[PDB]
Design an enzyme around this catalytic site. Structure first.
Site, mmCIF file in Angstrom:
data_model
loop_
_atom_site.group_PDB
_atom_site.id
_atom_site.type_symbol
_atom_site.label_atom_id
_atom_site.label_comp_id
_atom_site.label_asym_id
_atom_site.label_seq_id
_atom_site.Cartn_x
_atom_site.Cartn_y
_atom_site.Cartn_z
ATOM 1 N N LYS A 48 0.805 -1.217 0.000
ATOM 2 C CA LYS A 48 0.000 0.000 0.000
ATOM 3 C C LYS A 48 0.847 1.280 0.000
ATOM 4 C CE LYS A 48 -4.061 -2.157 2.197
ATOM 5 N NZ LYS A 48 -5.024 -2.028 3.357
ATOM 6 N N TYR A 101 -12.402 -3.040 -2.991
ATOM 7 C CA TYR A 101 -13.033 -2.893 -1.681
ATOM 8 C C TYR A 101 -14.555 -2.751 -1.756
ATOM 9 C CZ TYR A 101 -8.480 -2.357 0.609
ATOM 10 O OH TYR A 101 -7.208 -2.570 1.108
ATOM 11 N N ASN A 114 -2.199 0.611 6.841
ATOM 12 C CA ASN A 114 -1.793 -0.651 7.452
ATOM 13 C C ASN A 114 -0.927 -1.511 6.525
ATOM 14 O OD1 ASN A 114 -3.569 -2.007 5.712
ATOM 15 N ND2 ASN A 114 -5.281 -1.782 7.157
ATOM 16 N N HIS A 132 -2.286 -5.418 1.921
ATOM 17 C CA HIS A 132 -3.480 -6.219 1.711
ATOM 18 C C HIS A 132 -3.097 -7.656 1.378
ATOM 19 C CE1 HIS A 132 -7.413 -7.493 0.217
ATOM 20 N NE2 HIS A 132 -6.709 -8.178 -0.666
ATOM 21 N N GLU A 141 -9.885 -10.910 -6.659
ATOM 22 C CA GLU A 141 -8.877 -9.856 -6.598
ATOM 23 C C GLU A 141 -7.793 -10.017 -7.669
ATOM 24 O OE1 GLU A 141 -7.726 -10.001 -2.481
ATOM 25 O OE2 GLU A 141 -9.702 -9.301 -1.808
HETATM 26 N N1 LIG Z 1 -10.489 3.976 9.068
HETATM 27 C C1 LIG Z 1 -10.871 2.680 9.100
HETATM 28 N N2 LIG Z 1 -10.512 1.870 8.092
HETATM 29 C C2 LIG Z 1 -10.885 0.587 8.103
HETATM 30 C C3 LIG Z 1 -11.623 0.085 9.160
HETATM 31 N N3 LIG Z 1 -11.847 -1.217 8.918
HETATM 32 C C4 LIG Z 1 -11.260 -1.517 7.735
HETATM 33 N N4 LIG Z 1 -10.668 -0.414 7.256
HETATM 34 C C5 LIG Z 1 -9.918 -0.297 5.987
HETATM 35 C C6 LIG Z 1 -8.505 -0.807 6.219
HETATM 36 C C7 LIG Z 1 -8.565 -2.235 5.727
HETATM 37 O O1 LIG Z 1 -7.275 -2.661 5.263
HETATM 38 C C8 LIG Z 1 -9.616 -2.198 4.624
HETATM 39 C C9 LIG Z 1 -10.322 -3.530 4.448
HETATM 40 O O2 LIG Z 1 -10.853 -3.937 5.707
HETATM 41 P P1 LIG Z 1 -10.773 -5.468 6.122
HETATM 42 O O3 LIG Z 1 -11.126 -6.528 4.769
HETATM 43 O O4 LIG Z 1 -11.738 -5.711 7.352
HETATM 44 O O5 LIG Z 1 -9.267 -5.625 6.716
HETATM 45 P P2 LIG Z 1 -7.933 -6.366 6.148
HETATM 46 O O6 LIG Z 1 -8.357 -7.820 5.294
HETATM 47 O O7 LIG Z 1 -6.991 -5.278 5.166
HETATM 48 O O8 LIG Z 1 -7.135 -6.758 7.450
HETATM 49 O O9 LIG Z 1 -10.532 -1.164 5.027
HETATM 50 C C10 LIG Z 1 -11.984 0.946 10.190
HETATM 51 O O10 LIG Z 1 -12.659 0.526 11.157
HETATM 52 N N5 LIG Z 1 -11.597 2.223 10.131
HETATM 53 MG MG LIG Z 2 -9.961 -8.099 3.783
#
Ligand SMILES: Nc1nc2c(ncn2[C@H]2C[C@H](O)[C@@H](COP(=O)(O)OP(=O)(O)O)O2)c(=O)[nH]1
Ligand SMILES: [Mg+2]
Ligand SMILES: Nc1nc2c(ncn2[C@H]2C[C@H](O)[C@@H](COP(=O)(O)OP(=O)(O)O)O2)c(=O)[nH]1
Ligand SMILES: Nc1nc2c(ncn2[C@H]2C[C@H](O)[C@@H](COP(=O)(O)OP(=O)(O)O)O2)c(=O)[nH]1
Ligand SMILES: Nc1nc2c(ncn2[C@H]2C[C@H](O)[C@@H](COP(=O)(O)OP(=O)(O)O)O2)c(=O)[nH]1
Ligand SMILES: Nc1nc2c(ncn2[C@H]2C[C@H](O)[C@@H](COP(=O)(O)OP(=O)(O)O)O2)c(=O)[nH]1
Ligand SMILES: Nc1nc2c(ncn2[C@H]2C[C@H](O)[C@@H](COP(=O)(O)OP(=O)(O)O)O2)c(=O)[nH]1
Ligand SMILES: [Mg+2]
Ligand SMILES: [Mg+2]
Ligand SMILES: [Mg+2]
Ligand SMILES: [Mg+2]
Ligand SMILES: [Mg+2]
Lengths: 133, 133, 133, 133, 133, 133
Positions: free
Chosen positions: D8, D49, D112, D115, D126
């Site tokens: 990212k 997403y 973070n 991905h 994806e």
């Molecule tokens: N600001 C914010 N961003 C979030 C939150 N939950 C998810 N995101 C963003 C960061 C994640 O990398 C992305 C996808 O969410 P995910 O599929 O639950 O997490 P992940 O598979 O990258 O660990 O969306 C959230 O609660 N707050």
């Molecule tokens: Mg995910």
């Protein structure tokens, strides 16, 4: 046995290289005997530290850079610490600094060059007196 | 949040200061204050660990903490207290997890490289001890 | 305690010998004995793994263990057996935790870089196999 | 299995691209495809997403994902999907474990670093988004 | 294709640099073909190893140092291994050893200098015969 | 400000050194502006890339090596990127490459030498046109 004055410059903080730089000196078996953290160094100490360069075209820009972020001032002690840490530091000019040195591996600018180290016994005493009066 | 970290004398003896600081730096926590102690005053150590005053290891631990240098650091970041506690790892070498500072580097319950505040209330108290300014 | 560690032939193939030994070294365990085997005798391997003699993978594992060099090491430290087991990580690549040797470096149930004794009784037996002196 | 990984824009900003790729490389996963994006098209990010389209952070996350470069990588290995997910670590900085990529390096829920596909079905989707060829 | 004799000296054990040193040689793609661990090397082997220096003022002190802790003797094999590992080792004198070399990065004394490596084909054969009769 | 063309060679993939090499360039603060992954580079692009060497005895063997595994082609940008990355790369000949350089630390063969980097402004433009038409 000598003491030398090192500054970790604001670019090291910006690039998260503070531990990397300190680690290279630590692994060489040099000991910290004094250390201070400056959230922003006073302009006057910076100008005194670099007083030799006061009439050079880059002086003001260099001083501005040096107060643009935090610095750490460290006194290191070891046998022939002054020349040894200078060797580890590497040349000011990124066209000259050797891979394996701090600047050779990590710095890419003649001004934003991560680290200061005293260049002689006389300047070490002077610089230590500035940062650790 | 702001949290109080100590780099303990065993980190100096084992040349692990940069390694420990580097693990915190790479997690993107910012140094807000820092002090180097060639030897911390015993009274300061006793205050820092006052809640352990009745424990059998209290004096031995105080002796250890004044046996060499300490660096005290205030770090700042969102939820810095809990996050740095998790990086630190458990006090007990039978429990601290590989990947944590203690899990990877510490092999004793007492000589365990690093202190980190455990709560907001203790962070305030410890910062006031080490940085009364 | 003393424990018996094997650096397996995949560590040699993948140039991970120092990486693995370094993880144990940084945890402050001391080498008490060490032997290098250009190729361990199959009989030695069969004895080391005698408890797996009825398992389907027994022969394949023995073949792997004689497919390249091994270093056998006796390490010493307080609770060294359990501690090095925790650093080693689980046999199963679906379970070994990031931060452990296998969690970070191993991607197969068989070719899994490192052996470590699992108990005091097995440590005695294995040390007697590899270091009969 | 094949899984889709994104490096990212925060990894580029913080000069952590090689560090992240190196953690996956050292686990012995093989790169099967890779693309560099100076800036990914917003539509691509929105599709990637799409399941978060109703979440409050959806737009902010899309803005972040187009704020700098991305590298998209298809990695291959036995059980690569779950294994790389475990190396990645939890989304939440209060939970991601030391030793994981996010546990060691990420300090925000959104920014973070990495991905990784979460299932075989999402991996297929994806990979088809990022590598329609 | 050549073989060379390396000693990991007692200071490497004291400073926990054994894996660091072996790792630098391993990453250069040199292969271990023999290795022995000595909890304390016999005085006579040390004196024979350094027989060229028997009439020098530092001989006795050097021999005392060399039996002050463990050593590892290793035979490494590779194309032009002798000169290549000498280059990696770095100059005896810490005022001369270049950053990037083992001694340049890690050693800070002319005597306690972490590593021995054969300086020629003839001395390699001689030294291998001493440590691996 | 310059752009230079780097190839990560098939030996880097075989030895799992891709991130190590990219990391050395990244830590020097050079930015990726283009990148492509080749599972196997076309013979014709390789022969064009090395057209200067077409009449040398090693040409065919070098081309065979270069298509023996994956390569990554990267365009890096920075002030004086061409000479700086050449310095980081190190001499072709493993008897000459300096410790601290990529080849000095990691390569052990004149042909299997991990990395290509443009040697001049003119060749950079030419090589970029080949890999990124
Ligand atoms: N600001 C914010 N961003 C979030 C939150 N939950 C998810 N995101 C963003 C960061 C994640 O990398 C992305 C996808 O969410 P995910 O599929 O639950 O997490 P992940 O598979 O990258 O660990 O969306 C959230 O609660 N707050
Ligand atoms: Mg995910
Ligand atoms: N922009 C610019 N800055 C310069 C130049 N020469 C020196 N400086 C800055 C960066 C140096 O770290 C600082 C002090 O110069 P120095 O004592 O010759 O170098 P050094 O002991 O830091 O290697 O002034 C220069 O030529 N151009
Ligand atoms: N020798 C010994 N020392 C101990 C023991 N428990 C705690 N200590 C020492 C080491 C600890 O870092 C310090 C404070 O104890 P703590 O607040 O429970 O642990 P921690 O917050 O540093 O992980 O006291 C103990 O059981 N034995
Ligand atoms: N192919 C294969 N090999 C296995 C399996 N279970 C164990 N092995 C091999 C690899 C192990 O390192 C070795 C000994 O098994 P163990 O005592 O249960 O594991 P460990 O103490 O090395 O973690 O046998 C297995 O299920 N499949
Ligand atoms: N104190 C002291 N020790 C020395 C001196 N010269 C050599 N030695 C010691 C350290 C060397 O590792 C060892 C063998 O000397 P050498 O063969 O000239 O150096 P080297 O091949 O280890 O770089 O003897 C010296 O000048 N002073
Ligand atoms: N076997 C062999 N291969 C060679 C020799 N000289 C060059 N090569 C191969 C490896 C080089 O990476 C490639 C291009 O040669 P180059 O432009 O002189 O070197 P370089 O810019 O890669 O350091 O050709 C050589 O003398 N022998
Ligand atoms: Mg100067
Ligand atoms: Mg506590
Ligand atoms: Mg077992
Ligand atoms: Mg010699
Ligand atoms: Mg060339």
């Amino acid at each position: 046995l000598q003491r030398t004055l090192v500054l970790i410059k604001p670019d090291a903080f910006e690039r998260s290289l503070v531990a990397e730089i300190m680690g290279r000196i630590e692994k060489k078996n040099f000991k910290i005997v004094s250390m201070k953290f400056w959230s922003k160094a006073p302009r006057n100490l910076i100008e005194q530290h670099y007083k030799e360069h006061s009439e050079q075209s880059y002086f003001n820009d260099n001083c501005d850079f040096m107060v643009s972020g935090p610095i750490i001032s460290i006194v290191y002690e070891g046998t022939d610490a002054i020349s040894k840490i200078r060797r580890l530091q590497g040349n000011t000019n990124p066209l000259a600094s050797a891979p394996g040195t701090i600047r050779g591996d990590l710095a890419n600018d003649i001004g934003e060059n991560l680290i200061h180290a005293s260049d002689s016994e006389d300047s070490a005493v002077d610089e230590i007196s500035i940062w650790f009066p």
